[PDB]
Design a protein around this motif. Structure first.
Motif, PDB file in Angstrom:
ATOM      1  N   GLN I   1      47.273  32.240  32.962  1.00  0.00           N
ATOM      2  CA  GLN I   1      48.519  33.045  33.383  1.00  0.00           C
ATOM      3  C   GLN I   1      48.957  32.951  34.839  1.00  0.00           C
ATOM      4  N   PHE I   2      49.437  33.973  35.489  1.00  0.00           N
ATOM      5  CA  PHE I   2      50.180  33.958  36.477  1.00  0.00           C
ATOM      6  C   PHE I   2      49.868  35.252  37.395  1.00  0.00           C
ATOM      7  N   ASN I   3      49.107  35.093  38.589  1.00  0.00           N
ATOM      8  CA  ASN I   3      48.379  36.128  39.408  1.00  0.00           C
ATOM      9  C   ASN I   3      49.391  35.977  40.607  1.00  0.00           C
ATOM     10  N   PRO I   4      50.089  36.685  41.254  1.00  0.00           N
ATOM     11  CA  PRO I   4      50.516  36.562  42.662  1.00  0.00           C
ATOM     12  C   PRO I   4      49.528  36.777  43.687  1.00  0.00           C
ATOM     13  N   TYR I   5      48.217  37.726  42.963  1.00  0.00           N
ATOM     14  CA  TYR I   5      47.154  37.881  43.651  1.00  0.00           C
ATOM     15  C   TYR I   5      46.242  36.549  43.805  1.00  0.00           C
ATOM     16  N   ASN I  55      43.398  44.702  55.530  1.00  0.00           N
ATOM     17  CA  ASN I  55      42.906  43.535  55.210  1.00  0.00           C
ATOM     18  C   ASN I  55      42.766  43.192  54.028  1.00  0.00           C
ATOM     19  N   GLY I  56      42.745  41.904  53.303  1.00  0.00           N
ATOM     20  CA  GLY I  56      42.450  41.545  52.272  1.00  0.00           C
ATOM     21  C   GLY I  56      43.537  40.361  51.761  1.00  0.00           C
ATOM     22  N   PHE I  57      44.406  40.798  50.807  1.00  0.00           N
ATOM     23  CA  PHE I  57      45.560  39.794  50.264  1.00  0.00           C
ATOM     24  C   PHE I  57      46.519  40.240  51.303  1.00  0.00           C
ATOM     25  N   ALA I  58      47.228  39.152  51.893  1.00  0.00           N
ATOM     26  CA  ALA I  58      48.363  39.228  52.880  1.00  0.00           C
ATOM     27  C   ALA I  58      49.522  39.747  52.504  1.00  0.00           C
ATOM     28  N   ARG I 101      49.445  51.823  42.102  1.00  0.00           N
ATOM     29  CA  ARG I 101      48.244  51.288  41.465  1.00  0.00           C
ATOM     30  C   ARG I 101      48.760  50.872  39.918  1.00  0.00           C
ATOM     31  N   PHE I 102      49.892  50.909  39.720  1.00  0.00           N
ATOM     32  CA  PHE I 102      50.778  50.544  38.472  1.00  0.00           C
ATOM     33  C   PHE I 102      51.121  49.283  38.435  1.00  0.00           C
ATOM     34  N   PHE I 103      51.193  48.805  39.721  1.00  0.00           N
ATOM     35  CA  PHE I 103      51.561  47.129  39.889  1.00  0.00           C
ATOM     36  C   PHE I 103      50.425  46.979  41.128  1.00  0.00           C
ATOM     37  N   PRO I 104      49.169  46.929  40.809  1.00  0.00           N
ATOM     38  CA  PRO I 104      47.838  46.643  41.730  1.00  0.00           C
ATOM     39  C   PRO I 104      47.995  45.915  43.079  1.00  0.00           C
ATOM     40  N   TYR I 105      47.429  46.622  44.095  1.00  0.00           N
ATOM     41  CA  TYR I 105      47.271  46.376  45.538  1.00  0.00           C
ATOM     42  C   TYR I 105      45.986  45.922  45.789  1.00  0.00           C
ATOM     43  N   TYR I 106      45.557  44.904  46.757  1.00  0.00           N
ATOM     44  CA  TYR I 106      44.386  44.420  46.758  1.00  0.00           C
ATOM     45  C   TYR I 106      43.832  44.265  48.252  1.00  0.00           C
ATOM     46  N   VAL I 128      42.835  51.079  45.019  1.00  0.00           N
ATOM     47  CA  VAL I 128      43.496  51.841  43.904  1.00  0.00           C
ATOM     48  C   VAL I 128      43.945  53.203  44.367  1.00  0.00           C
ATOM     49  N   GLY I 129      43.724  53.504  45.647  1.00  0.00           N
ATOM     50  CA  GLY I 129      44.089  54.848  46.227  1.00  0.00           C
ATOM     51  C   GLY I 129      43.094  55.283  47.063  1.00  0.00           C
ATOM     52  N   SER I 130      42.805  56.742  47.133  1.00  0.00           N
ATOM     53  CA  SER I 130      41.914  57.436  47.417  1.00  0.00           C
ATOM     54  C   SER I 130      41.578  57.457  49.072  1.00  0.00           C
ATOM     55  N   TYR I 131      41.074  58.373  49.713  1.00  0.00           N
ATOM     56  CA  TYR I 131      40.900  58.311  51.091  1.00  0.00           C
ATOM     57  C   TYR I 131      39.417  59.126  51.588  1.00  0.00           C
ATOM     58  N   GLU I 132      38.817  58.926  52.608  1.00  0.00           N
ATOM     59  CA  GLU I 132      37.645  59.448  52.854  1.00  0.00           C
ATOM     60  C   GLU I 132      37.535  59.200  54.325  1.00  0.00           C
ATOM     61  N   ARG I 133      36.502  60.352  54.857  1.00  0.00           N
ATOM     62  CA  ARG I 133      36.455  60.356  56.353  1.00  0.00           C
ATOM     63  C   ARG I 133      35.168  59.602  56.706  1.00  0.00           C
ATOM     64  N   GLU I 134      35.255  58.696  57.535  1.00  0.00           N
ATOM     65  CA  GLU I 134      34.370  57.974  57.862  1.00  0.00           C
ATOM     66  C   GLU I 134      33.837  58.025  59.424  1.00  0.00           C
ATOM     67  N   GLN I 135      32.783  57.597  60.151  1.00  0.00           N
ATOM     68  CA  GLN I 135      32.616  57.241  61.531  1.00  0.00           C
ATOM     69  C   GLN I 135      32.820  55.769  61.591  1.00  0.00           C
ATOM     70  N   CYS I 136      32.454  54.879  60.716  1.00  0.00           N
ATOM     71  CA  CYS I 136      32.396  53.683  61.137  1.00  0.00           C
ATOM     72  C   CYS I 136      32.612  52.808  59.832  1.00  0.00           C
ATOM     73  N   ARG I 137      33.361  51.725  59.795  1.00  0.00           N
ATOM     74  CA  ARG I 137      33.670  50.994  58.671  1.00  0.00           C
ATOM     75  C   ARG I 137      34.176  49.702  58.878  1.00  0.00           C
TER      76      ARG I 137
END
Lengths: 243, 233, 233, 198, 212, 242, 204, 245, 222
Positions: I1-5, I55-58, I101-106, I128-137
């Motif tokens: 098939q075809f993936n732009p990803y 960071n990931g796919f440009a 997330r209905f046309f997914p980001y990566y 897919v969404g979501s956020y969280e608190r971190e110190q370091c990642r």
């Protein structure tokens, strides 16, 4: 008949001016903003022994830091408030913080100019400007205690004291002399009660008058009939002792 | 969802200290049949930008009309000063890339890979990439398709960093470009004999050499024949 | 009679213009007075802001539309918001789509069309608010006058608001002087203050009243409001 | 699934509807509902998806109670049953069908006769003296045809229903730890708290 | 991921896991999996991180809007049910969540309503949701009782989570504990599975009556 | 489509259509409302210019929103029906979504809101009816009486009257009600309502209709004899002498 | 599960002299388990009889559509619909529902009450118009049923003799099935009296 | 201008009436008379056919008597043209209750849907309202016979005997005296005719300046037979009651 | 098939101090084993002491950052010169991702800066969404290699001073920005050896109360 595109030879529309006449056929509403808190006062009025004045109110909550007093056609402001709350809640979702009093007045005023019989740039979802003016007071921790006069015209003014309604000319003059930013929250309320009695054609009691305040420790809190009464007695006694 | 039925191959480009050079063969393939030769791949836009397209010819004709619209509307509402506010490489790039990015995101893709080359009349050198995948990047040397594989390592030896740039004059850069293409014609047959070569000079603007054909030929290989596919009974 | 030609926007009168256009024109003057001047490298706007009362305070009427673009109004606040919102979307698109900072000439022509369109209906209306739209792009600084009729003129200095003429005649005098003060933020600000005072004849010139706004060769859109104009008086 | 049985006796409609949701070894809850009161004289049982249940129910309840207030007479079990069938008969043609198969027990109080309507998620409505969904019926129709013959008391029915459920938990490997049983009659809707032989 | 909530005399005890992992070596030992709808209400993150984070906050806004509008505290039942109706419309959209909407109201008490992506809204006084749920329910059930004091109820939660962390490797870095009272939740701290493991092994002797 | 205006703002400040709406209320029926501590009674006089009707196949003037919420009106039949239709959908909708029947206050806001909205848009003009909205909130026993008018304004009242010859009966309430004692006797609340309508109906004691709403779906139409009994009693009061 | 053979059903129609007859089973099943001995798959609006076999949900939705169409037409024209007119009405409704996913086999029966003809006509899954008057069969066992009708049937029969034919023809075709037990009915129609005879037959 | 062609005649007046509505009430008084008698054994409907030529036919007596359903029929006072638009929408309204719940529509509901629609046109759309009144004759087993009337304002009421059209007042006055709690259909047939003769704006009375129907319990079914008597069948009945003249 | 990803390189690292915070990323862009660029930033200033990197796919990351830059513009315009904080942005950014997330980001997005508190915060998003608190990642391709080193030297988890190494530890304490950049350099210099999705150059944007400071170190080039 008539249209709604008509200007006067000045260049200011008809309906707008007529809206200012409606505000003056409301009752006096007074807001004074001082260093600590904003006080908002209204006449509830009580015209009959059979009327429940102690079951209605004219000071409405927009948010947990923003109140409003109105004067005019008090139904027309239900649409306006409903829209403001929707805006106010949406900002709490989108950034997790208080909505500026000013950013809101601006939003609400944009839809007060939305009257027409249809045009090709914009939605029209009213035929006529609202019959109603607002004093919106609030607190944000960016420019503190504030007061704004929201016009049905769509102009928006920043203030420190403003009265609207039929007696606003007399109340605003007294206010200009009394206004200081060294007045405590309680003081502002007492000076508000003195004036509010004056402009009134009938005795001032809890059963026709409502106080309300904005504190940054507990937000917009509509004050009790009882607490406001207690001060009305204290006003009555000091005033009748300098005579 | 598109299935390539036609290809154009190869656009290679590089920067030199005072400009950029870009060259491309002229090609309309139907696979291995060189159906059309007279399909321009280098569409000069103004006189300080060249848009180089490789990939599908069918998408390419559509873009060819949009690139011509881009010139037209920039003379609209801007009558004069059309080289200080019009036809700048960054604009050409940006215009094209927004249509590309939207077409691939809705599953109806512009199946090209594009190089936009220039010398900005407001700036210095421009060489910026866009593809069907939506990724964009800048590098001193950029090449698409088969040239992305083969040409670009030769070109990187010329310039690959700011330090290598002063060390490439007009002469050396043009020699690199001519050398690269010849490598492309030699080791891929999809590439046409016929090319166009464009130099976009920081002093001279756009000088475009048309209807060139690859020369200084390799034929050396014929000496060393032993067979490689020949059968004997 | 009067009521025929005010009550409809899809009309014309024997003069060559409808009465509603005469009232909208009157309405710009009903604004508070503001001058605009440029030498074509920097552009400044100096504006007298009135507030209703001692118990009112000033609210903004110089509008950042981008970090290189803005406007001042004179006339109707409700309308001014509608127009400002439009110019802002317009500034944003110009950056996203073309990498442009938007010329005034291109912006004006687009604002014109919308205005025209709302006289092509009943229950749409001319804005009745005028704007001096400034910005600094690549052809330099620019000052435009937009009127809600759709008349777009670029002027080197101008004024709109009540008693436009006072500053305008001062400006036609000092012209030759200011256009050869090129490259100076501070000389031009000083000029603006001097200018606005030839408008005045029934109003006071005070620190809090006055408001200055700049964009220019080495200045992205920065406003001096309130306190921060005292040192140019 | 959820196993839902019905018997119409001469006086009443008895519906047996599961009293447990079993996850592995142990009952995560054993207070779970599989029936919703549509009206004072209308009760409706469900089996299918647990979440398709509630949605369907709350819609059907809301439409029928709007009709009831408006028309000044609660609708008949036959009107309500047809109504439900029709709604199912749309959703089946659409992309997401409701996937809950119901047993509707009603007492027509205006004339005084019991009625049972068994409606599949297809939207097939059929009247019976007794019924079941699934694999169930293969064992328990053989008990029913043999040991039961119409016109017996409500009390004989509770013991019949117990024999059904006992066979089902034994020989079928389905676990659902019996039923809580409810009667729709002339007196309306009562939960029979006992299940010790009922 | 194992998340549980149980009803008892002093309210609800809500106990949850927290863990973020880099390989199988545990990178960090603290995160949220309580979404704070409002101060009186909780909805728990499990079975779809984004879906919970976004929509419980969004649900939180309809709650704040209703509490302004009518001057009326929202019920746990009405809040859950508004979400559930809508959800079934977005079911097929990738939309997945498995959550308990927990509240303690004056009108309805401690109330836990179980919600999944189906339009499901179910009543019960004891819930576990997860993948280690079956084992966690075991520990809970055998020690269950509404008439348990607050202190031992808090350990019950913590131990049930611990047990579920040992067998399944998707939980266990620390366990976070929260007690919902009617004025809002009071935290009862974050407890290291390392230290805690040693205590439990000796002390509880359940699955451990002969130490293993 | 169509969206030309029918609402046009008055240089009064009080719109034309609102003011002409209120006239429509005065021509219509008469409705009065009295609250108890345990009841809210809504009385209506019947005026049949000629009667060949029955009273059981005519639509009655107190109309159910719910089993325990009523709405009563003065004005035109036609308009009021529209207000009713929208409210029966709203009744059910709260019941579906919050799992609880309506609060009275929200419903009142709702009936007002539709009226207010038709004042505000073009292409619609507002309704010729004023209403009495009464009922009981979930877990409650305290009566609620609110009055809504075509301006879209509403407010609470312990006693009210609307429709034909409002003035006379308002005064009659001012001198025959107590605010330290709303009557906690169902009989005296019906009594006052019967006195009020008596003075206007002209003849006939079965051209008086009482509807009593007590808590928990108790909506009751009291029958002919019961009504006669208060009327007897009112003539004993009027032909009292010492 | 099955497309139309979940609950089964078969239908037979015959022509005679100033009579026709139309007969059906009463099975409703849930897979191969017979559930019910009652389910009436033939309906009528006045002197036009419509039997539709197949899936029950689809027979019900159609039956209510034709009832609607006929009622409102009856109301406007001030008289009943005719066999001949109803066959036209059916073709088109079915051709509207070919695109939709229905699974039906209608058969149309009646006697014209002012043209004086027996009339039967047939319809399928595709919904094509079949003009024949002898017998028309439809349903699951339609293959067995044509073999049987074509030998057993003889042209032009009195009502009694039409009964003996239809009854036996159905009963023996049905006996080679399990999807066509659970009782059966036969209707013998003249346009001024209808006789209903229940048969006693096999089940599983 | 668009609003400079508008006249806004759809709005409340300074008297608080609706211009166009009041005008429609007038229309109904210039059309034929319609009378509805409900008895507890039947419903007798008459509507008066005015302008009767001899080259107008007498083979039609369905042209102001319309069956809306097979238990509901109306008599029209008004135009054929106004009525027809609503008549089709009524018949449809019938089929909807019938398909969904598999039983006959209540009269009281069906009436409401027409009235709301009439009401709608004068509030919104800029439209004229319909100039038509209906007298509804229908049967339910929750209420027995019901008889309603709806009129151009969107107001509808129940009556147990009613008149509409020319000379309404006079007919009604006669109706009020001759009415009696006890009923039979054949008694009601006599009653209708005695009255009809005395309300005509033309001398005596003839069968053709009438359109007639009765609702009796059964005559080719179990109950509820609507019989619309054709002109000649009316001619016979004028002799039978003893209004032979 | 075809993936732009497809795949695009990059590795990023976000570090919360308690008076500083840094957001570092390498500059390598690849697709497969060809070099797309040896210097293109994946690391962006969105302004106001917000630094942001997807960071990931440009193709998705750029589009996300531009989208966010227009939200900065709109905030300052409609709310009269009002500062957006990292959290406030975090929530805004969350809504854009879940919106699409209905046309997914990566992408593995991280935003960093300093709070109006003054203490560091680093927030991490999933594709897919979501956020969280971190110190370091650590985010991107060598996230799994960096993070085990990082937990020890920054977070002092799984890091113990010899003794009993369970009651005796190297404690969690205030850290210095210079020694942290030294740590950052080390993580990337270990990464270029073991990943080819990392290479060429290191841009660290270091966020302090005295503003936004940029530092540049070079890395290995093939």
């Amino acid at each position: 008949d008539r249209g709604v595109s008509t200007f006067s030879p000045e260049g200011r529309l008809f309906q707008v001016e007529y809206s200012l006449e409606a505000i003056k056929l409301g009752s006096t509403a007074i807001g004074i903003a001082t260093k600590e808190g904003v006080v908002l006062g209204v006449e509830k009025r009580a015209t009959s022994p059979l009327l429940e004045s102690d079951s209605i109110e004219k000071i409405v909550e927009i948010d947990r830091h923003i109140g409003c007093a109105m004067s005019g056609l008090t139904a027309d402001a239900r649409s306006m408030i409903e829209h403001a709350r929707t805006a106010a809640v949406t900002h709490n979702l989108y950034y997790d913080e208080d909505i500026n009093v000013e950013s809101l007045t601006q939003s609400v005023c944009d839809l007060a100019l939305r009257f027409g019989e249809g045009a090709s740039g914009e939605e029209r979802l009213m035929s006529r400007p609202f019959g109603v003016a607002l004093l919106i007071a609030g607190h944000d921790a960016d420019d503190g205690y504030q007061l704004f006069h929201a016009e049905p015209s769509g102009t928006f003014y920043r203030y420190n004291a403003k009265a609207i309604g039929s007696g606003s000319e007399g109340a605003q003059a007294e206010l200009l002399n009394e206004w200081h930013s060294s007045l405590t929250l309680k003081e502002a309320e007492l000076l508000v009660l003195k004036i509010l009695k004056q402009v009134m054609e009938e005795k001032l009691d809890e059963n026709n008058a409502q106080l309300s305040c904005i504190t940054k420790q507990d937000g917009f809190k509509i004050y009790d009939n009882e607490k406001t009464a207690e001060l009305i007695k204290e006003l009555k006694e000091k005033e009748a002792a300098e005579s | 969802t598109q299935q390539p039925i036609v290809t154009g191959t190869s656009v290679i480009s590089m920067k030199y200290d005072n400009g950029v050079i870009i060259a491309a063969d002229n090609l309309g393939s139907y696979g291995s049949l060189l159906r059309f030769n007279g399909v321009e791949r280098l569409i000069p836009v103004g006189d300080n930008t060249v848009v180089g397209i490789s990939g599908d010819i069918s998408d390419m004709q559509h873009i060819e009309r949009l690139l011509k619209d881009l010139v037209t509307e920039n003379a609209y509402d801007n009558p004069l000063a059309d080289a200080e506010e019009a036809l700048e490489p960054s604009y050409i790039f940006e215009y094209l890339a927004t249509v590309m990015y939207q077409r691939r995101s809705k599953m109806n893709p512009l199946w090209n890979a594009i190089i936009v080359a220039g010398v900005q009349s407001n700036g210095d050198q421009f060489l910026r990439y866009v593809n069907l995948l939506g990724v964009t990047y800048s590098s001193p040397t950029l090449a698409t398709g088969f040239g992305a594989h083969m040409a670009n390592p030769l070109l990187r030896k010329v310039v690959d960093r700011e330090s290598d740039i002063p060390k490439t004059t007009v002469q050396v850069a043009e020699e690199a470009i001519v050398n690269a293409m010849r490598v492309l014609y030699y080791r891929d047959a999809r590439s046409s004999r016929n090319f166009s070569l464009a130099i976009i000079d920081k002093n001279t603007g756009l000088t475009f050499k048309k209807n060139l054909q690859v020369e200084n030929m390799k034929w050396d290989f014929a000496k060393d024949i032993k067979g490689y596919g020949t059968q004997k009974i | 009679f009067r009521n025929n030609y005010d009550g409809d926007t899809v009309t014309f009168s024997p003069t060559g213009r409808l009465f509603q256009v005469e009232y909208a024109l009157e309405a710009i003057k009903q604004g508070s007075v503001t001058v605009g001047l440029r030498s074509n490298t920097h552009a400044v706007l100096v504006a007298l802001k009135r507030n209703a009362d001692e118990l009112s305070s000033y609210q903004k009427k110089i509008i950042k539309c981008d970090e290189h673009m803005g406007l001042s109004l004179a006339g109707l606040a409700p309308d001014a918001r509608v127009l400002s919102n439009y110019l802002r979307q317009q500034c944003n698109y110009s950056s996203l789509v073309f990498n442009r900072k938007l010329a005034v000439e291109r912006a004006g022509h687009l604002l014109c069309d919308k205005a025209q369109k709302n006289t092509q209906s009943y229950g749409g209306r001319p804005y009745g608010v005028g704007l001096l739209i400034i910005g600094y792009d690549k052809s330099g600084a620019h000052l435009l006058e937009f009127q809600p009729s759709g008349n777009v003129t670029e002027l080197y200095g101008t004024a709109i608001g009540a008693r436009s003429q006072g500053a305008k005649t001062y400006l036609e005098r000092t012209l030759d002087t200011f256009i050869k003060i090129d490259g100076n933020p501070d000389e031009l600000i000083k000029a603006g203050v001097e200018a606005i005072s030839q408008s005045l004849r029934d109003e006071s010139l005070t620190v809090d009243n006055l408001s200055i706004a700049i964009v220019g060769k080495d200045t992205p859109f920065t406003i001096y409001d309130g306190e921060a104009v005292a040192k140019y008086i | 699934m959820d196993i839902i049985l019905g018997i119409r006796v001469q006086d009443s409609v008895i519906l047996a509807s599961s009293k447990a949701v079993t996850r592995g070894i142990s009952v995560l809850k054993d207070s779970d509902d599989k029936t919703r009161q549509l009206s004072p004289h209308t009760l409706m049982s469900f089996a299918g998806e647990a979440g398709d249940t509630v949605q369907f129910a709350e819609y059907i309840q809301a439409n029928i109670q709007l009709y009831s207030i408006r028309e000044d007479y609660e609708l008949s079990p036959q009107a309500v049953s047809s109504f439900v069938r029709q709604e199912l008969a749309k959703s089946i043609r659409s992309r997401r069908p409701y996937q809950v198969n119901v047993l509707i027990g009603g007492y027509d109080k205006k004339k005084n006769k019991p009625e049972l309507y068994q409606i599949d998620y297809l939207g097939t409505k059929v009247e019976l003296p007794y019924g079941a969904h699934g694999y169930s019926g293969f064992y328990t129709f053989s008990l029913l045809d043999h040991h039961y013959r119409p016109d017996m008391t409500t009390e004989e029915g509770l013991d019949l229903l117990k024999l059904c459920v006992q066979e089902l938990e034994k020989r079928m490997p389905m676990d659902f730890k019996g039923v809580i049983v409810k009667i729709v009659d002339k007196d309306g809707i009562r939960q029979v708290d006992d299940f010790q032989a009922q | 991921t194992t998340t549980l909530a149980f009803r008892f005399q002093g309210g609800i005890i809500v106990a949850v896991d927290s863990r973020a992992t880099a390989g199988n070596w545990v990178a960090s030992q603290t995160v949220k999996r309580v979404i704070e709808i409002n101060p009186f209400l909780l909805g728990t993150m499990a079975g779809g991180a984004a879906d919970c984070q976004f929509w419980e906050t969004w649900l939180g806004s309809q709650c704040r809007l209703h509490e302004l509008r009518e001057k009326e505290r929202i019920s746990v039942a009405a809040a859950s049910k508004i979400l559930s109706n809508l959800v079934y419309q977005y079911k097929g959209a990738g939309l997945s969540m498995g959550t308990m909407i927990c509240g303690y109201t004056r009108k309805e008490g401690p109330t836990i309503y179980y919600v999944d992506s189906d339009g499901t809204r179910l009543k019960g006084d004891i819930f576990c949701v997860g993948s280690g749920q079956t084992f966690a329910y075991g520990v809970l059930d055998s020690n269950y009782k509404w008439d348990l004091s607050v202190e031992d109820a808090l350990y019950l939660g913590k131990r049930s989570i611990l047990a579920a962390a040992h067998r399944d490797a998707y939980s266990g870095g620390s366990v976070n504990l929260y007690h919902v009272t009617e004025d809002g939740w009071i935290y009862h701290g974050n407890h290291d599975v390392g230290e805690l493991f040693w205590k439990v092994k000796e002390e509880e002797g359940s699955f451990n009556n002969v130490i293993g | 489509g169509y969206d030309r205006a029918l609402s046009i703002f008055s240089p009064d400040g009080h719109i034309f259509q609102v003011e002409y709406a209120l006239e429509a209320v005065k021509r219509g029926t008469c409705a009065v409302g009295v609250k108890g501590k345990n009841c809210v009674v809504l009385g209506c006089e019947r005026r049949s210019t000629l009667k060949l009707q029955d009273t059981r196949i005519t639509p009655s003037k107190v109309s159910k929103i719910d089993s325990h919420v009523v709405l009563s009106f003065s004005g035109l039949n036609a308009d009021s029906r529209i207000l009713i239709e929208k409210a029966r959908v709203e009744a059910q909708s709260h019941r579906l979504t919050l799992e609880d029947p309506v609060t009275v206050e929200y419903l009142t806001r709702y009936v007002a809101g539709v009226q207010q909205r038709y004042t505000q848009s073009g292409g619609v003009r507002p309704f010729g009816v004023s209403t009495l909205i009464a009922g009981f909130d979930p877990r409650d026993d305290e009566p609620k009486l609110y009055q809504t008018e075509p301006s879209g304004i509403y407010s609470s009242w312990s006693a009210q009257t609307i429709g034909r010859n409002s003035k006379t009966v308002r005064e009659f309430l001012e001198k025959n009600y107590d605010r330290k004692e709303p009557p906690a006797t169902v009989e005296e609340c019906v009594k006052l309502t019967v006195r009020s309508l008596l003075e206007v109906v002209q003849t006939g004691a079965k051209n008086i209709e009482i509807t009593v709403v007590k808590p928990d779906s108790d909506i009751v139409a009291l029958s002919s004899e019961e009504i006669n009994q208060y009327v007897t009693q009112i003539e004993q009061e009027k032909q009292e002498q010492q | 599960s099955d497309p139309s053979s979940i609950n089964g059903g078969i239908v037979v129609a015959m022509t005679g002299k100033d009579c026709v007859a139309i007969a059906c089973d009463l099975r409703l099943g849930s897979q191969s388990l017979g559930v019910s001995n009652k389910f009436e798959k033939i309906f009528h609006y006045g002197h036009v009889f419509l039997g539709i076999t197949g899936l029950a949900t689809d027979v019900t939705t159609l039956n209510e559509m034709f009832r609607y169409k006929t009622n409102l037409y009856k109301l406007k024209e001030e008289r009943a619909i005719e066999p001949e007119t109803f066959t036209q009405l059916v073709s088109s409704s079915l051709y509207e529902r070919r695109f939709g996913p229905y699974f039906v086999g209608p058969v149309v029966a009646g006697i014209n009450s002012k043209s004086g003809k027996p009339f039967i006509a047939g319809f399928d899954l595709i919904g094509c118009i079949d003009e024949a008057k002898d017998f028309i069969v439809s349903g699951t066992a339609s293959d067995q049923l044509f073999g049987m009708c074509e030998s057993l049937y003889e042209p032009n029969l009195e009502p009694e003799d039409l009964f003996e034919t239809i009854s036996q023809a159905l009963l023996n075709a049905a006996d080679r099935d399990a999807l066509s037990g659970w009782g059966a009915v036969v209707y013998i129609i003249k346009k001024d009296e209808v006789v209903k005879r229940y048969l006693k037959m096999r089940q599983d | 201008g668009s609003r400079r062609y508008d006249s806004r005649t759809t709005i409340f007046s300074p008297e608080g009436r609706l211009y166009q509505v009041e005008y429609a009430l007038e229309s109904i008084s210039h059309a034929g008379t319609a009378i509805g008698i409900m008895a507890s054994d039947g419903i007798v409907l008459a509507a008066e056919r005015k302008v009767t030529s001899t080259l107008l036919e007498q083979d039609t007596s369905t042209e102001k008597l319309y069956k809306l359903n097979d238990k509901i029929a109306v008599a029209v006072a008004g135009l054929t043209a106004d009525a027809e638009i609503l008549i089709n929408t009524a018949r449809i309204h019938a089929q909807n209750y019938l398909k969904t719940y598999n039983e006959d529509i209540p009269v009281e509901i069906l009436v409401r849907r027409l009235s709301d629609i009439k009401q709608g046109y004068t509030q919104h759309g800029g439209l004229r309202p319909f100039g038509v009144s209906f007298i509804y004759a229908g049967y339910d087993d929750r209420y027995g016979y019901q008889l309603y009337t709806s009129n151009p304002s969107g107001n509808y009421t129940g009556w147990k005997a009613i008149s509409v059209g020319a000379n309404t007042s006079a007919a009604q006055t006669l109706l009020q005296m001759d009415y009696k709690d006890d009923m039979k259909v054949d008694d009601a047939i006599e009653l209708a005719l005695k009255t009809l003769s005395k309300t005509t704006d033309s001398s005596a009375l003839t069968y053709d300046r009438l359109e007639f129907a009765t609702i009796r319990k059964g005559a080719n079914d179990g109950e509820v037979y609507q019989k619309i008597f054709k002109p000649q069948e009316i001619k016979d009945i004028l002799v039978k009651t003893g209004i032979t003249k | 098939q075809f993936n732009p990803y497809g795949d695009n390189g990059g590795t990023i690292l976000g570090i919360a101090g308690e008076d500083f915070a840094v957001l570092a990323g390498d500059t390598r862009n690849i697709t497969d084993y060809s070099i797309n660029s040896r210097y293109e930033p994946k690391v962006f200033d969105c302004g106001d002491n917000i630094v942001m990197s997807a960071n990931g796919f440009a193709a998705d990351g750029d589009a996300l950052v531009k989208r966010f830059k227009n939200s900065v513009k709109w905030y300052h315009f409609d709310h009269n010169d009002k500062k957006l904080s990292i959290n406030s942005a975090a929530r805004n950014i969350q809504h854009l991702l879940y919106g699409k997330r209905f046309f997914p980001y990566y992408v593995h997005t991280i935003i960093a800066g300093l709070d109006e508190d003054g203490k560091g915060a680093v927030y991490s998003f999933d594709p897919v969404g979501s956020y969280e608190r971190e110190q370091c990642r650590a985010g991107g391709a060598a996230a799994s290699l960096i993070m085990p080193f990082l937990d020890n030297q920054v977070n002092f988890k799984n890091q113990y001073e010899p003794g009993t190494n369970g009651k005796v530890k190297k404690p969690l304490k205030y850290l210095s920005v210079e020694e942290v950049i030294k740590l950052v350099r080390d993580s990337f210099t270990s990464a270029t050896e073991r990943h080819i999705q990392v290479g060429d150059g290191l841009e660290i944007l270091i966020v302090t109360k005295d503003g936004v400071r940029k530092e540049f170190y070079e890395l290995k080039r093939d």
